[PDB]
Write a protein that binds this ligand. Structure first.
Ligand SMILES: [Mg+2]
Ligand SMILES: [Mg+2]
Ligand SMILES: [Mg+2]
Ligand SMILES: [Mg+2]
Ligand SMILES: [Mg+2]
Ligand SMILES: [Mg+2]
Length: 137
RNA sequence: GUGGGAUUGUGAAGGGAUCUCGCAGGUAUCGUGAGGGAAGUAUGGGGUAGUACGAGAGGAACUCCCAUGCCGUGCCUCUAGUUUCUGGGGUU
């Protein structure tokens, strides 16, 4: 689909990363980590922090990395999370780290390589990431 | 009428009068429903369709399917949390 609207095409996934979380960057663009600012498609509720999960597009900024990428607001897609989630076939699964990839507002991926596995929930929603994924788990 | 009690404060025994109360319900189920409360609410995707309209740039919507947010009422098969079963083990 390659669109920021994912709730209507993705099953429920337990939320993992509230605002202020720092995750690894799995691309080869020179960024080393990403800081979560907000989540696309979040409707508000008093006192509740926005929280992201697999396959979500977030607004972020680079804290450690090449100076040409820092002090700006960018778009990223979450591909790995440590919070365990349950699939409809009854399997509970989780990763070892939290990782995302910097992309375009239209979902086009900046960079040309991905390190580590990529979740199927993200691969199905974003095809270019699925193209560059070394392994889809 | 019947059965119980009791009369005003100064000793005991008998009678009389008067007054008050009781004289039919108890126990156990299944239901009715006047009146009162009152709740569900939003977004996206597929398809319609690169269609209608428009010189062109551009660019919709309903029946019908599939998901999600908030709210509400429960539940403990799975996953996670909690241990004064101090359960089993280890260690100063
Ligand atoms: Mg507050
Ligand atoms: Mg009524
Ligand atoms: Mg609903
Ligand atoms: Mg347990
Ligand atoms: Mg338990
Ligand atoms: Mg001991």
């Amino acid at each position: 689909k390659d669109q920021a609207n994912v709730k209507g095409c993705r099953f429920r996934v337990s939320v993992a990363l509230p605002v202020g979380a720092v995750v690894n960057c799995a691309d080869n663009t020179g960024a080393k980590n990403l800081y979560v600012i907000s989540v696309k498609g979040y409707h508000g509720r008093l006192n509740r922090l926005p929280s992201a999960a697999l396959g979500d597009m977030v607004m972020c900024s680079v804290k450690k990395g090449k100076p040409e990428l820092r002090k700006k607001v960018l778009n990223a897609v979450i591909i790995r999370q440590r919070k365990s989630w349950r699939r409809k076939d009854g399997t509970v699964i989780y990763f070892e780290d939290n990782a995302g990839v910097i992309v375009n507002p239209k979902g086009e991926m900046k960079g040309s390589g991905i390190a580590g596995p990529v979740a199927k929930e993200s691969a199905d929603l974003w095809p270019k990431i699925s193209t560059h994924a070394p392994a889809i788990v």
